[PDB]
Symmetry: C3
Subunit: 277 residues, 3 copies
């Protein structure tokens, strides 16, 4: 039986930094000098609270803003609500999450579980256009009790005309072995719509990207249109029914793939070999 | 227990007008001189019939065309089917709705319930491009028996590079008190794709925007890509788990929010105060 | 009771050709000299295997690449994996499909069923941009056991600024009689997003486009945003609740319908007459 996420309700503490990178980008990190684009994955269970001690090491104001999770207005990360951070400053952002349940009026409160993301909201403009462009974005996963857990999680961000702010034709590539349970968090940012496509693999267009059983009527897809700040995720069994191979993933807008918004899902046999690669 | 929509089947009569507005726009209204952009909300129960006595008070041909609801071709509101209205003329449009049910072949007929809209189809071009641009659009809600009813309904229309044809940076803003059940009808028109986003709140990507219980696998989202003539709706509990605040809603295409396609969901405490606002 | 698809598991063999057309386009066909744009419909049952003996009759390299179905890397139809076809050459592509079922870890493997498509991947660029533009695309339907079968299937492809590569304002038009069960396969290709809309009809936004019964919460829609390589399908009862008529279907992006990306769903009475047409 597959590993599943247990019941949440833990108070978690975390440090985060925003940093200017040597190449002109901006990234988040859990440690000073280890900022990355995309920023590090934040993964919690429904019911967890997260207190993020956020330090802005940059010479301009910056913030942390999160989609999907519960936060009071004092943690919304906007200039309007006095929620961003001065250069060199520190602020504790609090993100909460809740489980689904019956309200007293008999309606059903949805839980926080899903594939979400965080990003800056004040660099360049009051909607963080410059911060997002420079790399201040990262993924958030909230698990429901009983959600299937993967062997590994990869984050793919279509940010304007880049994947993960990389130069075109430089991937990123990811690797797995036939049979691995691989999780993809797929986020879009910027100005343009995209369509995310994976060769050789498919998933369900629902909350978890997988079906629980035969009663779920969700479309099974391998291609999905996205726009700025959309987030979704899914899991696949690497090579299931198709075998090892260099499986391309790309934006399917023809000029986007033509310019190099493409990467490789490298699915290996145990000996590491990939047929035709 | 929350208020729910009862079984439909009523024949309803309604007057509607299309009018040129003093500022050059065009709007629909239930009363001459009270046209609005967006036009007034039409809300019925599945099974209701609606006879709309429509008067075109303008100096150009205009029509009423509806998405989703049942109409015969004589009410489709197009020039092709001789269904538009001459200047100063009157025409009765008939919209019907039906409940879901079993067909005799054992398949399931879907009902009319959902978030829909109406708009002009002949001003400027034979697809109403000029009419839609000028403001001839409005929302339609069809309730299924047992659908949860809100405290209030707000209509948000991304029409080209405007919200509800307003100048950028002029909202609209909406207000609620913590705990209100607030309904949003979200319609898109024109030339451009958009992504609708709300701070501090989320909904289900399904027919009603809410989950009935734990078996619904729909994605819970706070960001949604839309294109011309898309319509969806949802309900939220204002401030649920997040408290009072000036909660922004905006298009998340970065240049769109930067140019001012943003508004405020003002969620107040009982004393009317909003923290940080 | 409606006709339904039986259990699959047949090995099927098929010949296909890619041909240059006299007008400069490129099309697939099951017979030399009978290539079409879109290419012919491939319809199988979950569990079927399809061996396609593909001949490239053109003077440039070409390939067959399929979405959704199972194929080994040797059938992915890309130059990278040595999977395309030299001018005048022949290659057997193998597509497999599987039924859903329980994995040994207790998770649910999704089946292949759905609305899919095939297209070239090497004409013009290594993502088939030139091949797709010229007409090398076609529909694939994989049926699950018990899926409702239609009276007829029509394929509508929004390819850049054309429907099915036709000149604007030339349809295509389709015909049915009131009460026919009509299936639509709706595919998008190229550079641009679109919104597909049908007058007088609606469907469910799920795998089959129809609801099985009252428990399915999928949105019922008549308008849907699509991007390059999206595919979906649905069935409607022609004229159900609305009667005979010339029912327009069009892209609802206003400049797209204005330029003529529109066609007619001609729903006739038994005597062939169409009111207002
Ligand atoms: Cu925002
Ligand atoms: Cu792209
Ligand atoms: Cu593909
Ligand atoms: Cu955002
Ligand atoms: Cu129309
Ligand atoms: Cu926008
Ligand atoms: Cu936000
Ligand atoms: Cu319309
Ligand atoms: Cu590809
Ligand atoms: Cu279009
Ligand atoms: Cu319409
Ligand atoms: Cu493709």
């Amino acid at each position: 039986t597959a590993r599943t996420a247990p019941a949440g309700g833990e108070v978690r503490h975390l440090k985060m930094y925003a940093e200017k990178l040597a190449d002109g980008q901006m990234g988040y990190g859990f440690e000073k000098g280890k900022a990355s684009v995309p920023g590090p994955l934040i993964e919690v269970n429904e019911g967890d609270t997260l207190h993020i001690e956020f330090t802005n090491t940059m010479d301009v104001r910056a913030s942390l803003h999160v989609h999907g999770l519960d936060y009071e207005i004092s943690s919304d990360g906007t200039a309007m609500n006095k929620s961003d951070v001065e250069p060199g400053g520190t602020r504790t952002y609090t993100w909460r999450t809740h489980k689904p349940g019956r309200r007293d009026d008999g309606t059903w409160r949805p839980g926080s579980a899903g594939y979400w993301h965080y990003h800056d909201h004040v660099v360049g403009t009051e909607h963080g256009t410059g911060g997002i462009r420079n790399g201040l974005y990262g993924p958030v996963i909230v698990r429901r009790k009983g959600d299937v857990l993967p062997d590994a999680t990869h984050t793919i961000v279509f940010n304007d005309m880049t994947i993960n702010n990389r130069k075109p034709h430089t991937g990123p590539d990811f690797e797995a072995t036939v049979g691995d349970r691989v999780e993809i968090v797929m986020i879009t940012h910027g100005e343009y719509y995209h369509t995310f496509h994976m060769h050789g693999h498919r998933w369900a267009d629902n909350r978890t990207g997988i079906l629980t059983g035969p009663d779920d009527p969700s479309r099974v897809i391998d291609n999905k249109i996205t726009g700025p700040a959309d987030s979704f995720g899914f899991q696949i069994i690497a090579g299931e029914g198709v075998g090892a191979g260099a499986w391309m993933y790309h934006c399917h807008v023809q000029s986007h793939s033509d310019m190099g918004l493409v990467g490789l899902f490298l699915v290996k046999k145990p000996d590491g070999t990939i047929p035709g690669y």
